[model samples]
Target: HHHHLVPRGSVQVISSYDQFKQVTGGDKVVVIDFWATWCGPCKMIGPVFEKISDTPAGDKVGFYKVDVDEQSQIAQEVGIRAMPTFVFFKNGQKIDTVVGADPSKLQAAITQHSA
Candidate 1:
């Protein structure tokens, strides 16, 4: 049996601009993790971010992962300058962005926004 911090059912792997649009354009608050495999901070924060998606606090949010390397166009459009950037969206608009692998700050932001 396999276990995951982020529920498999909730985390959507976005590959295209349209897919990205569909996930973020909804009424649910979306927590988007923009990451590339080559990024070290991305690796560290990846699990922490996943943990958030499984918590009760995450009930109000949808989790998503976007490979910035493969989805360069969307990354560029979003003006992502760093890897492992966490972008929060609500009502199809960007509400907040957090860079680096700070778990405490990430959780704080997640809690604040989830409410």
Candidate 2:
């Protein structure tokens, strides 16, 4: 499938590591938004994530979520010691990282890298 042609949206149901590998394995920068159902901060960041993913900016960005509570191995493999960790990837390699629930920071981080 054409990389760009693949639908860009909030991908939340990554049931396998292979799925995540495909999402991360490229030059494209994929943002893995680590979140859980019971986290207050995760709840707060949901709208911002949706807002970002809906924007034209999101087309170039692959936004996904990992439910640590459900996927412990995957989450641990990504070094997620905390909830709401925004792990950045480029060319399938882990590059930049941001941990916490700050939307402004995430936006700025995206803009900074996008430039």
Candidate 3:
């Protein structure tokens, strides 16, 4: 169960596997960042992720994040072995995955899929 604590125009946090399903199972495109609190690259990409979320594309895409340490079940379910893996989903299907903190590539993926 998640608190839905993150503000708008930023990454929403998913704390449970069920919530992750509820989120990614939507018809809308969703971009989920699989990260951890102690991950340096995760921190590095955090701001860029936020800024992109503020863009118009965010209105069409569901931006979210799951802490691998806190939500291990989700991390396992999603097969996230990296620190900052960006998973893209559309209509409940896994479309693409970016396993790093590359801002440009991340944005490009979002733009490519969200459209």
Of 1 and 3, the candidate ahead on lDDT is 3
Can you write out model 1's per-residue Cα lDDT over 1-115, one digit (the tens) per residue?
A: 6974545336678989998888789788888899988899888899888877878866788888999989987898889988888999877789999888889888988898888
Query: Relative to the true structure, how large is the alpha-carbon lDDT of every model?
Result: 0.85, 0.78, 0.86
Q: Give the local distance difference test score of model 3.
A: 0.86
Poorly placed runs, candidate 1 (over 4 Å): 1-9
lDDT for each residue of candidate 3 in 14-63, tens digit (9 for 90 to 100)? 97888888888978999998887788988899889888998888999989
Q: Which of 1 and 2 is the better model by lDDT?
A: 1
For each of the candidates, the C-alpha root-mean-square deviation to the true structure, in angstroms, is 3.5, 5.9, 6.7
lDDT for 84 in candidate 3 is 94
Number of the predicted model whose lDDT against the real structure is largest: 3
What's the TM-score of every candidate structure?
Answer: 0.88, 0.84, 0.88
Q: Which ten residues in a row have the lowest lDDT in candidate 1?
A: 3-12
Lowest lDDT sum, 10 consecutive residues, model 2, at 2-11
Which ranges of candidate 3 are over 4 A from the true structure? 1-8
Q: Is candidate 2 or candidate 3 better by lDDT?
A: 3
Kindly report which residue stretches of model 2 are placed more than 4 angstroms away from their true locations once superposed. 1-12
